[PDB]
């Protein structure tokens, strides 16, 4: 009953990001329990105009977390061109992982919209806790290729 060692398992473990896209020829998942820096040297390719949702896979292990929020600030050629907040909600503990889907979004289209992007994601809550922060890239092209 008096524990000699701490379990060290965070109450909230953000496990993954996935772009749910029917048109995509291959996988589009970020294993967030792994190495996060390597994501900056890779990218997700999305054909212009295609619809997709962003699935944030997380585990709420022990306590109820209120007002969960998933924030994305997107960058193009070094400068921030977008800021989007998504309301995830209040989640109680569970053995089974949670999968939060954002509303249907579209990949941008046009000459001025194609190119390389860089998203700085933050999964947070009411007490503004940093459950996880990571950077991933999205390259918008004419075709999947």
Task: Provide the number of structural domains found in the chain.
Answer: 1
Measuring CA to CA, which residue among 114, 30, 118 is closest to residue 72?
A: 118
Angstrom CA distances, 93 to 4, 6, 61, 84, 121, stand at: 24, 19, 5, 26, 23
Q: DSSP assignment of 26-74, as one string?
A: S--EEETTS-SGGGGGS-EEEETT-EEEEEEEEEE-SS-EEEEEEEEEE
Angstrom CA distances, 81 to 2, 73, 124, stand at: 51, 8, 21
Resolution in A: 2.5
CATH number at residue 49: 2.70.50.30
| Domain extent at residue 53 | 1-145
Q: How many other C-beta atoms lie within 10 A of the C-beta of residue 97? A: 12
b/e burial code for range 44-81 (CB count within 10 A of at least 16 → b): bbbbbebebebbbbbbbeeeebeebbbebebbbeeeee
Query: Are residues 142 and 22 in contact, defined by beta-carbon separation less than 8 angstroms?
Result: no
Method: X-ray
Backbone angles phi, psi at 40, to 5 degrees: -75, -20
Both tokens of 129, joined, read 């806790």
């Amino acid at each position: 009953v008096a524990v000699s060692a701490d379990p060290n398992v965070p109450n909230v473990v953000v496990t993954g990001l996935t772009l749910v896209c029917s048109s995509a020829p291959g996988p589009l998942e970020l294993d967030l329990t792994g190495d996060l820096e390597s994501f900056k040297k890779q990218s997700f390719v999305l054909k212009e105009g295609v619809e997709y949702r962003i699935k944030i896979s997380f585990r709420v292990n022990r306590e109820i977390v209120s007002g969960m929020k998933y924030i994305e600030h997107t960058y193009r050629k070094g400068v921030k061109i977008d800021k989007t907040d998504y309301m995830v909600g209040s989640y109680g503990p569970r053995a089974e992982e949670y999968e939060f889907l954002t509303p249907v979004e579209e990949a941008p289209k046009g000459m001025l919209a194609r190119g390389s992007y860089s998203i700085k994601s933050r999964f947070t809550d009411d007490d503004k806790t940093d459950h996880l922060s990571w950077e991933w890239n999205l390259t918008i092209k004419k075709d999947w290729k």
